[PDB]
């Protein structure tokens, strides 16, 4: 608390660091997020999220963090989801606009980049365009998608306004324990089911509850079937087949 800071009276002010403090703060709100793991292969992209129950009275199969942008682009939100509520609407609009103007699928990168333009509008009124935010968003996205010009892409969208193309990425609280494992286990010879079970693997270790289909959710983007959210039954099957190969060691 009350960490020493010389500037919290502006929202765009320096900072003997040389960078914005509020942006820095924003990236420290993704460390409380519920873990979202995402494995990108050349055969599809798999997005797994822990749905995060907080009560057994809470119905957790009516809440989810998998949010469809369009048939060929899916997205996972981690951090503060009330902010994502706004951003995801904007992105859906953008995609539909592109298909209106061009009768064409939007690039995964172009979309990610549009939402980064959205992220950077915090201010009191400055540059040529009106600031309609006052404080930056505190929510990060894993935008997965497939386009016919670069194949499968997985992008990490920051509340900074910066985007990095990843081949696998984890965000949330357990993101470091997951990324250590990503660095070692990932390669470019994976297949779809191998990556799927890899997600359930690394989701196990960042599991703070227990792994089953009632606090864990999978979804895929595939080329010829589009974006598909795995129902809970199928997820259960995969979890049990993980437990089979876990007792083969």
């Amino acid at each position: 608390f009350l960490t020493r800071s010389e500037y919290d009276r502006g929202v765009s002010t320096f900072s003997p660091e040389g960078r914005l403090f509020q942006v820095e703060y924003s990236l420290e709100a993704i460390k409380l997020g519920s873990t979202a793991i995402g494995i990108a292969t050349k055969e599809g992209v798999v997005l797994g999220v822990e749905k995060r129950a907080t009560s057994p009275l809470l119905e957790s199969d009516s809440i989810e963090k998998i949010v469809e942008i369009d048939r060929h682009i899916g997205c996972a939100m981690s951090g503060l989801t009330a902010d994502a509520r706004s951003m995801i609407e904007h992105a859906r609009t953008a995609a539909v606009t592109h298909n209106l103007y061009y009768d064409e699928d939007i690039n995964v990168e172009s979309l990610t980049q549009s939402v980064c333009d959205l992220a950077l509008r915090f201010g009191e009124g400055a540059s040529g365009e009106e600031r309609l935010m006052s404080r930056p968003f505190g929510v990060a996205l894993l935008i997965a998608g497939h386009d016919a010009d670069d194949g499968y892409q997985l992008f990490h969208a920051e509340p900074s306004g910066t985007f990095y193309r990843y081949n696998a990425k984890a965000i949330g609280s357990g993101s470091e324990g997951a990324q250590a494992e990503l660095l070692n286990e990932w390669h470019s010879s994976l297949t779809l089911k191998e990556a799927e079970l890899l997600v359930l693997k690394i989701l196990k270790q960042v599991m703070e509850e227990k792994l089953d289909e009632n606090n864990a959710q999978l979804s895929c983007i595939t080329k010829q079937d589009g974006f598909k959210i795995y129902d809970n039954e199928k997820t259960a099957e995969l979890i049990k087949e993980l437990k089979e190969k876990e007792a083969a060691e």
Partner: protein, 391 residues
């Protein structure tokens, strides 16, 4: 009421009275020290007594005059004195205390200089046997220290073969709970050099310039000492950055901050004074007590790795009775990146759960509960993100 209360009132007051009376009549005793292995001391104790040979008015040299001396006594009273026949003339130095005859002032026995320090004899410390293996890990940051501080005390040969100037100073900094001071207690075990330990808030006195005396004299006493180390602990107060206030009360503190600079560089080098500064914070420090030539190598002390926590926890659980077949790896994974001071407390709180189940042993079950216990309180508390930016 009940038919005893009328006399319970009196009987009870009698208890209060008689305890006072027993103690008063018994009397007390307050020792006036003696020794049982002594029962005769006055066969020539009277030669130290009664027939003076003599106790002496302590003085101080203010002026050597070349071929008598001027002393001003502590009774402030100035006199002119010379040389008896237990004095040597080569042995009078400015500001040295001397003994002179209580009757006709003449030097009998010179005496160590400077009676103004008396609270620096309580910051001289024997080396606690926290052992040198006690420190966690076999990590490499403590091996850097063994190059700067420890080895030139053991062997200035290799530094003479190199011909370099051997590095003397080093900064200890990083998060607390990493055992900042715990590795310096280990290094106090190994090197067996004098350790003189300073508290930064102990350097602040009621009136200003009083702590200027303190610091200056402390240093020169260490110059006389040979093969010594001065461990600057917790000098975040006095030791901080210099700046102006124009009406502050920080100025009076900053005086002794300056006093720390002027002795380190000096107009003479540090003759085998190895210097440690221990700071919680690099976020504010002086730039001339953090200049790189007088703190030479500065070692960042880090958080244990996923291996490093396994090493620390093995030092800790090898010290505990646990029933074999356990993983010290597993417990590190369950924890986030964290301190070993938590690991020192995962054992002890798991031991309170061990006594609760009334085990003589500790098992896996009670370790799990403990890991949850500490993490949850950490979140409830500061410094789960506090570093006060910079690297």
């Amino acid at each position: 009421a009940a038919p005893y209360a009328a006399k319970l009132k009196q009987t009870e007051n009698d208890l209060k009275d008689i305890e006072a009376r027993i103690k008063e009549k018994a009397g007390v005793k307050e020792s006036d020290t003696g020794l049982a292995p002594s029962h005769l001391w006055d066969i020539m104790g009277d030669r130290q007594r009664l027939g003076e040979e003599h106790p002496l008015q302590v003085a101080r040299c203010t002026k050597i005059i070349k071929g008598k001396y001027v002393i001003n006594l502590k009774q402030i009273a100035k006199f002119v004195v010379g040389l008896g026949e237990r004095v040597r003339p080569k042995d009078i130095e400015e500001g040295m205390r001397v003994g002179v005859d209580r009757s006709k002032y003449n030097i009998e026995l010179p005496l160590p200089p400077r009676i103004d320090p008396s609270v620096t004899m309580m910051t001289v410390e024997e080396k606690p046997d926290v052992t040198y293996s006690d420190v966690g890990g076999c990590k490499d940051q403590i091996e850097k220290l063994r190059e700067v501080v420890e080895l030139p005390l053991l062997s200035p040969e290799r530094f003479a073969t190199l011909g370099i100037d051997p590095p003397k100073g080093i900064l200890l900094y990083g998060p607390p709970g990493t055992g900042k001071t715990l590795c310096a207690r280990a290094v106090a075990n190994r090197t067996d050099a004098t350790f003189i330990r300073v508290i930064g808030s102990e350097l602040v006195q009621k009136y200003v310039g009083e702590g200027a005396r303190m610091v200056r004299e402390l240093f020169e006493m260490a110059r006389t000492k040979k093969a010594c180390i001065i461990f600057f602990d917790e000098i975040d107060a006095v030791g901080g950055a210099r700046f102006d206030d124009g009406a502050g009360g920080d100025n009076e503190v900053q005086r002794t901050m300056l006093e720390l600079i002027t002795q380190l560089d000096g107009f003479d080098p540090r003759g085998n004074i190895k210097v440690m500064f221990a700071t919680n914070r690099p976020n504010t420090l002086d730039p001339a007590l953090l200049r790189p030539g007088r703190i030479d190598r500065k070692v960042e002390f880090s958080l244990p790795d996923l291996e490093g926590r396994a090493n620390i926890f093995r030092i800790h659980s090898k010290s505990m009775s646990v029933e074999r077949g356990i993983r010290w790896e597993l417990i590190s994974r369950l924890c986030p990146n964290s301190t070993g001071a938590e690991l020192r407390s995962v054992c002890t709180e798991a031991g309170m759960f061990a006594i609760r189940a009334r085990r003589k042993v500790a098992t896996e079950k009670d370790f799990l509960k403990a890991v949850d216990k500490v993490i949850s309180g950490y979140k409830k508390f500061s410094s789960t993100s506090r570093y006060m930016q910079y690297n």
